[PDB]
């Protein structure tokens, strides 16, 4: 074998000998995604997961990020 499970992107693209995933470039702090690969971007970009926090924020913007308790 040549590739094992990447820890940041989950795909078995993590080349053991280079210790760098081909899919997402872990362990570089950034993420590997090029403009010529537009399909590759859409396969992974924001929206293909839970977005548990952004859904929290988008919901709380309508009322103005208020804090407190109803009277």
């Amino acid at each position: 074998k040549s590739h094992t499970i990447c820890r940041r992107c989950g795909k078995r693209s993590f080349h053991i000998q280079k210790s760098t995933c081909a899919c997402c470039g872990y362990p570089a702090a950034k993420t590997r995604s090029y403009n010529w690969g537009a399909k590759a971007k859409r396969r992974r970009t924001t929206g293909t997961g839970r977005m548990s926090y952004l859904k929290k924020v988008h919901r709380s913007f309508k009322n103005g990020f208020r804090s407190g308790k109803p009277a």
Binding site: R42, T45, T46, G47, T48, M51, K55, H58, R59, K62
Partner: protein, 70 residues
């Protein structure tokens, strides 16, 4: 189409429907109380200014004027 908009198409969470559109969004007047009483919530601002006797602009109007009667 975007994964992001596919998320809330295949999700079960209701949208954030925000009800905003108003045909003829003629902004109502605050500021001076005298004008706010004698404003016409239908007619346009350049009609209302000329109705009250207030010059809407001191400079020439870069287009046509309104002539309803000969």
């Amino acid at each position: 189409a975007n994964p992001r908009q596919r998320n809330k198409q295949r999700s079960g969470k209701p949208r954030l429907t925000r009800r905003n559109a108003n045909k003829k969004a003629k902004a109502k007047i605050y500021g001076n109380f005298v004008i706010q009483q004698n404003w016409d919530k239908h007619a346009t601002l350049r009609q209302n200014y000329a109705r009250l006797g207030l010059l809407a602009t001191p400079n020439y109007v870069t287009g046509g004027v309104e002539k309803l009667y000969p």
